[PDB]
Design a binder for this molecule. Structure first.
Ligand SMILES: NC(=O)C1=CN([C@@H]2O[C@H](COP(=O)(O)OP(=O)(O)OC[C@H]3O[C@@H](n4cnc5c(N)ncnc54)[C@H](OP(=O)(O)O)[C@@H]3O)[C@@H](O)[C@H]2O)C=CC1
Ligand SMILES: NC(=O)C1=CN([C@@H]2O[C@H](COP(=O)(O)OP(=O)(O)OC[C@H]3O[C@@H](n4cnc5c(N)ncnc54)[C@H](OP(=O)(O)O)[C@@H]3O)[C@@H](O)[C@H]2O)C=CC1
Ligand SMILES: Cc1ccc([C@H](CCC(=O)N(C)O)P(=O)(O)O)cc1
Ligand SMILES: Cc1ccc([C@H](CCC(=O)N(C)O)P(=O)(O)O)cc1
Ligand SMILES: [Ca+2]
Ligand SMILES: [Ca+2]
Ligand SMILES: [Mg+2]
Ligand SMILES: [Mg+2]
Lengths: 410, 410
């Protein structure tokens, strides 16, 4: 049996996680859901609680904590440990019953639980790319300290890459380690992208797109922040750095390819030039499940891929002029040091501003660019604790700086 | 230090084998070509001997044995063991300084060397699908005895599938072994096809197609026999059975897909519905190479795949009315027993008849079908000496039956 905790369970990733767990459990009793953890969504959390009956429930916010104890009372013969805040999260991460944790918390906030889960030697099914981007070499140092802890990528492209690998090679090393790509004989990564909703617009249309146009479409079924990031292709930008860190592939060996059918989720080119790819309908259940079953696979009753019915698959290069966030991400990755933290932090603010119609499309890249130009490289701390503090302060600094730049230009 | 013998060195597979070995050795001096074996192409073999200086040369047609011996004296610093016939082949198969044997010998004939290589516990990089189709159950039995013998598929769709598998599991089993697909979590196989030259033709056009049509318009440079089989899609029919035997996959779990671009060379659907595919330009060098380096990869200077330039990939289901050879293969496969041997044997005749302009395109399938319809199930010999003999008997019966069906009509 596999004991699983779901962090951010009422969000997009967490809901998908619960679905695929539920559907698989109907075939064989594979998973136990031992913990749920959300931020405010007490009601939605309670409904999941009703059905899954986890031993642990937790809400980050204290203000909604009382309400949650009361709702839960309604459920008969169920008496769960009801916790709150960072404290509850640490209690969960350190339970001896929980084996694997799904981190579906959004933004830089997700780093906090990702680190405690590693410190506690857990398998971490990590959806939250903001954490790898902003805290890559820290998480690297944390994995070397806690040798049994593992990060298994849930981000669809990174799961796709991971599936295409020989696990006998993978087991010799692990995600986020130095030399991962050499052990696995990886030569190059094709990073697939939907292209987002703005893929066909001219530069002059781009100047005037609003947040509503970015959120509009039914094909983009995720949280509001990653939706916006898909529209600017900053999401792919962030996934380029995530690839660098998860697999230790050089930036010049990562190629972004727009594939609007979203069947081929990414491809790995090996040193012999043979390329391997993972394909399925655009669905996050596959990558979630794999991270929980890896290095094995289990039966699902998901719709099989009908290749004849999909019929056509297209590939083209993205326009760097229409999507300059991409180039910014490459520049920040290549620069190294804390430039990825700076990139991610300033994006968080520039993203939110566009979402709230406070800035225009091309301002996003304008803002992120000026913050990266302002940053001064710091020597990287040797001890984990000071590196952690260093990242927090640099992330906080960049948000502050983006807020200055924004305010100076409006 | 990989010591490789090349059987069929002068044909299309054998040539591509030497090409990839040549280019790979310019990077890393891995490969020793220890032996070369051909039928009659002595000047072509002499030109190859000179380049690769093998410890053994073997010519099958003994009438040209003196010619070979006398061309070879023109080579400096060279003193090879020069052998001929079956006995020459047997000697090579038993030599300890030979680890891997590439079988690029066409037709049923290739089963002899395949069997002897297995009996000497070699790794057999097998291009000759005819031996798997005629003698699948026997090869299986044989590999169960010579436990260190391995068959690694060289056929590109099968190498593709082989590559898509997770080697952490492949190493725990081997091709042609019970439970291969259970162990590897294989749900189904998408077996890809170029579709041949006749893929757009109506039925009335198909009636009239000739061998000149099939040979000028081919999708890859190959031997005449597979070229013709590609035109009728009997090749794919054969490959459906080769898949069944190599990978222990149920017939109703193998789906033929026409992919005219031939970038995707085949796809494996795993029990979770996730699909993994192998991709490269149309080439045989990689499938060959991988058969020779598995479980490892090595560097090549092959041109890397450029998905963006490729731009479009298409798929569709083949039509069984236009390509009845496919349907006959499933039927032979599903019936089991010696039906696949009959299918292969009668195809060898019909293919050749059409090649030589004696019969029409629908006569190929029509002749094969009658011979299949005529064959009567036999009890399967439980020992290897005998099963081999039984296979030879039926094979030559089916060949003679096909020829009789032709003679009684033209
Ligand atoms: N959604 C997708 O298809 C994909 C998502 N990702 C990544 O996965 C992550 C999650 O994205 P997504 O699911 O879209 O986002 P959502 O906004 O839909 O979900 C975020 C979840 O995190 C919870 N949460 C936020 N802060 C905290 C906290 N402080 N403590 C505990 N829980 C918290 C939210 O709780 P509450 O409901 O109470 O507010 C919610 O359940 C992102 O980092 C994203 O980049 C990556 C690839 C695909
Ligand atoms: N070519 C391709 O891309 C593919 C080929 N295959 C398979 O590979 C096999 C070979 O095909 P291909 O190379 O196209 O065929 P070719 O006709 O080009 O070559 C056959 C080779 O085998 C040699 N040969 C034939 N009979 C004997 C024998 N009695 N003893 C020793 N050598 C012999 C020939 O020698 P000689 O030159 O002296 O006549 C020749 O070198 C076939 O079974 C085919 O199905 C499978 C997938 C792809
Ligand atoms: C259909 C679909 C799949 C993937 C995405 C990507 C965004 C979401 C994501 O990162 N996933 C699913 O991993 P994008 O960055 O390629 O636009 C969008 C839409
Ligand atoms: C480009 C190309 C790929 C595959 C083929 C097949 C025939 C040869 C073959 O089996 N190969 C290359 O594995 P087909 O049966 O699909 O037509 C021809 C041309
Ligand atoms: Ca593999
Ligand atoms: Ca009968
Ligand atoms: Mg993604
Ligand atoms: Mg083939």
């Amino acid at each position: 049996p596999i004991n699983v905790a779901i962090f951010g369970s009422t969000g997009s990733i967490g809901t998908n996680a619960l679905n695929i767990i539920r559907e698989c459990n109907k075939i064989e009793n594979v998973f136990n859901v031992k913990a749920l953890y959300v931020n405010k969504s007490v009601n939605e959390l309670y409904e999941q609680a009703r059905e899954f009956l986890p031993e642990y429930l937790c809400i980050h916010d204290k203000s909604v904590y009382e309400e949650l104890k009361e709702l839960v009372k309604n459920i008969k013969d169920y008496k769960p440990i009801i916790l709150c805040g960072d404290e509850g999260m640490k209690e969960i991460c350190s339970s001896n019953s929980i084996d694997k944790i799904v981190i579906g918390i959004d933004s830089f906030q997700g780093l906090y639980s990702t680190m405690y889960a590693i410190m506690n030697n857990k398998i971490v099914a990590l959806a939250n790319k903001e954490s790898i981007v902003s805290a890559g070499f820290f998480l690297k140092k944390l994995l070397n300290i806690h040798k049994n802890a593992k990060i298994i990528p849930v981000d669809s492209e990174h799961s796709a890459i991971f599936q295409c690998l020989d696990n006998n090679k993978v087991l010799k090393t692990k995600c986020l380690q130095d030399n991962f790509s050499k052990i696995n004989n990886i030569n190059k990564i094709f990073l697939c992208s939907s292209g987002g909703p703005f893929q066909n617009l001219t530069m002059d249309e781009l100047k005037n797109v609003t947040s509503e146009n970015a959120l509009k479409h039914p094909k983009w079924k995720m949280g509001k922040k990653i939706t916006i990031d898909s529209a600017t292709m900053m999401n792919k930008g962030l996934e380029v750095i995530e690839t660098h860190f998860l697999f230790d592939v050089d930036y010049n060996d990562i190629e972004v390819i727009v594939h609007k059918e979203c069947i081929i989720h990414s491809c790995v080119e090996f040193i012999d030039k043979s390329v391997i790819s993972q394909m399925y309908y655009p669905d996050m259940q596959i990558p979630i499940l794999y991270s929980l079953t890896w290095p094995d696979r289990i039966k699902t009753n998901l719709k099989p891929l009908d290749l004849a019915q999909v019929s056509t698959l297209t590939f083209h290069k993205p326009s760097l002029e229409h999507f300059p966030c991409i180039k910014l991400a490459y520049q920040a990755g290549i620069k190294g040091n804390f430039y990825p933290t700076v990139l991610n932090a300033s994006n968080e603010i520039a993203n939110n501003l566009f979402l709230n119609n406070k800035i225009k499309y091309f301002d996003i890249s304008s803002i992120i660019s000026q913050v990266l130009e302002s940053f001064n490289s710091q020597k990287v701390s040797e001890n984990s604790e000071d590196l952690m503090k260093q990242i927090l302060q640099i992330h906080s600094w960049a948000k502050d700086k983006a807020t200055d730049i924004y305010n100076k230009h409006n």
